[PDB]
């Protein structure tokens, strides 16, 4: 249904989750992926089992941490000589937070707004040149639905998120004249590392009830591959005439009419 | 997941415009489509270039009101008769209304209101019992970006829209528990037959439909530079309706070219 | 204070419309409501009389889903305490309903109601409002118009349409002047309520401890129920000068009840 | 408004919209705190006021509200001298002009740490007293930016957005001890860089009045006029005060119109 053959889409933070099934979905329609996360050897694991489901895939990944603008820079460029200019680009490393108001020290918030702030910013900034270079153009940043309907044990990270949400529209405005567009989705309770982390402390009706507690109207906790799937259609000319918006992917926990 | 081959999709006002396109997305993802319409004539031919193009397809269209409840109930049978229970529903909105608040009488309010909110209501508690009864249900209401930012010349749709955008969150949340998704898009400006027919009573003779349109887009600040496409709308109105958007209920998608200045 | 306004509410013979011609009286403003029921309409007028000497204060029987009835009212409003320069829009109810308990007839009520409660008395005042200097309108609202409850279905709607036609009669009526609003009311104290604290079953807590837990269990962060006159000091606000760069927008009078940030 | 029997402080109170909360609040009658940053600024303002309000509550003190010892000594300072303080409001530091393009990350973390510390360090240092008061409430005066982001203000809409999500947080984790937390949403108001603007202007013919005014309908303010401090001032006091009593984790919009949101 989605042929990006054509396109060469770049995803930080691609060695699991939400940023893996989005690369997989990216490979999946044909297009040349790129991925970059800090642990080498996940990221080589990660990268030998999608040469493995992909036998012809144009793959690229590299150890990279999307905090440091120099790591960021020598990673675009290694990107643009390996498979050419890229047209896609997902912002997706990140990593929420437990606290209150009352819990989050300065430190803890100068962390939060710098890793929600410069994962967008640095891949954006080094990106942008060659997403500008290309037709079909367009950036996803991954976001939470905290971004817009705070959560009273997320203060810090519904704070940040709700930053980098008045950023993308900023974003979509500023590129529409270079062709790129921009956009983000908004996740609900995602299974994840650190749900099953929580588990630890059957599995299917352990997080039923989470469901239940957490009042989600389709009763279920998200799968990653749900989030990659709303990200490949903004990633997509799919979506060619949406920018400056976001995607629900929540399974119905937005209050907001 | 674009192969909606065992789905039954209905599409009301799908005779033309976004409503035509999206039943084509729909044949091509393998679907049985049904649609209705109010002129007869639109609906025959464009069902017959339909089958045309998709030779096999699964494809009943009949005249029918939405605003008239027992023409709806009777069009959700023969649906049902036709091609089996709906899995999804996509109600596409009837059209707006160039108006100020000064110049929107109580006649035309009540038209307005009625239309934005029935062409939803009839539809939906028609085949609700069939949605529900089936998997991966979903209903896709089709909006504007007025329904969040109104414009001057647009006061009474505007605020109709407003209010069913409220209902599809509603709808989603009550419709939950039965395994139907509910949500909508949020159209800009869309080529269309206002806009065509805008263009025929338009004051610039030398402008053509292609330099009217571009002049038209920068005069309405659409950042990405022209007017959306039905096959656009379409293709955000297939996504929601599809088990590609399996875990979203009770939203919206941006289709209006960047329109919104809401962060 | 508002002692030079001329203010005119539509509902105003109970809840927040009374609370409201209560503060625009004691505020000094000259001073206009209607409602359908003449009886209450003219008590509520008779103790307004007595609590507020020398007011100025007309009252008269109107309802406001009839055009001609409203004219008639506005003209009379011009005739006794001259041009309107605030308009507060009260008039209509909440109904208790879901998608599936809502019949058509219902859902035109509905959207009947809350409408053409505004447009109605909007039209028929305009002209006054935008002679006059510092003129405003509020129209009372709910959260549901952008937070819609599961068993209050046709009214979150009709609501968001009205909260959608307050941005743009903002837009339209400020080139000449007329600043318009609204709030969003969460839980209010009604009679209603009382109605059930009368029947408790079968505690010893008195208002003020039964409406604070009923509160807490419908998790409004403030802990206890909205009162008509806190909607009447944000109606209050809105109307007056202290105001005059807000347009085209709502107060929160909800306790925190809205998730949005 | 009797606030007679309030405590008030505004942070970033020697100027604008904080110096006009400040006598709105003196006005009120409020025994009132502020700080700033500028020595000079702060004295000049302290001297005005105490001619404006003859025998007022009022205690100013130079704070860098983004150094937490400083608030905190700050906040001591407040409660010996005024007594414990129910009322706090956190004015906005200023607004940055640049495009994405034209943002560096320095100036990104300076505007993140500016905007969203100058909320947090009065906030928590003060907490504890306005929790000891009753009808205690909390104002941050923040931007239509938050909501509704303009091409030249990238970093500030942003960091104005973090913080409008804040607020709501705030308001629900204090609500159980009874602080209420709003904030304003300020459109275009008259300050130091509009008077620098109309200083620098083509049309030397427009004096203040004029240009403004020029400026207002170029920028399509529906009011046909930028703000007043004391407008501003106006909301803030509301939602300070009891009148605003069942109002929490919201905002007022002080725009003159705006917003393009319904
Ligand atoms: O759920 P996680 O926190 O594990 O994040 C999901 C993905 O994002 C990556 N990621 C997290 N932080 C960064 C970072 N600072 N720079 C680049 N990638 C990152 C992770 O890889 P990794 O944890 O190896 O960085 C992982 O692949
Ligand atoms: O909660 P309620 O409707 O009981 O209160 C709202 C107020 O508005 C008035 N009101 C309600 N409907 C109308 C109407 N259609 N026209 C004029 N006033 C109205 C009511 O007075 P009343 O019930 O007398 O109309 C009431 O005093
Ligand atoms: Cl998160
Ligand atoms: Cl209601
Ligand atoms: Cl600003």
Redesign the pocket.
């Known amino acids: 249904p989605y042929d990006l053959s054509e396109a060469v889409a770049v995803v930080?933070?691609?060695?699991?989750?939400?940023?893996?099934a989005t690369v997989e979905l990216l490979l999946e329609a044909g297009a040349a992926v790129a991925?970059?996360?800090?642990?080498?050897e996940?990221?080589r694991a990660?990268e030998s089992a999608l040469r493995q489901r992909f036998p012809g895939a144009r793959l690229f990944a590299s150890?990279?941490?999307?905090?440091?603008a120099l790591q960021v820079r020598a990673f675009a460029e290694a990107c643009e000589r390996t498979l050419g200019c890229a047209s896609i680009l997902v912002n997706?490393?990140?990593?929420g937070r437990v606290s209150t108001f009352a819990e989050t020290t300065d430190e803890a918030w100068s962390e939060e707004l710098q890793?929600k702030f410069f994962?967008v910013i640095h891949p954006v900034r080094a990106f942008l040149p060659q997403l500008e270079s290309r037709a079909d153009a367009a950036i996803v940043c991954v976001n939470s639905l905290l971004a817009s309907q705070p959560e009273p044990h997320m203060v810090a990270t519904s704070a940040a998120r709700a930053g980098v949400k008045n950023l993308v529209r900023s974003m979509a405005f500023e590129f529409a004249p270079k062709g790129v567009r921009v956009n983000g989705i908004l996740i609900g309770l995602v299974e994840?590392?650190?749900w099953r982390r929580r588990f630890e402390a059957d599995w299917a009706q352990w997080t039923a009830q989470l469901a239940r507690n957490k009042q989600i109207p389709l009763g279920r906790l998200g799968k990653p591959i749900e989030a990659a799937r709303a990200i490949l259609f903004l990633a997509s000319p799919l979506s060619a005439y949406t920018t400056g918006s976001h995607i629900d992917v929540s399974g119905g926990l937005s209050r907001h009419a």
Request: with cysteine.
């Open positions: 930080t933070g691609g060695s699991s989750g939400i940023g893996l991925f970059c996360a800090r642990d080498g996940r990221l990660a150890v990279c941490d999307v905090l440091d997706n490393a990140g990593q890793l994962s994840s590392g650190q």
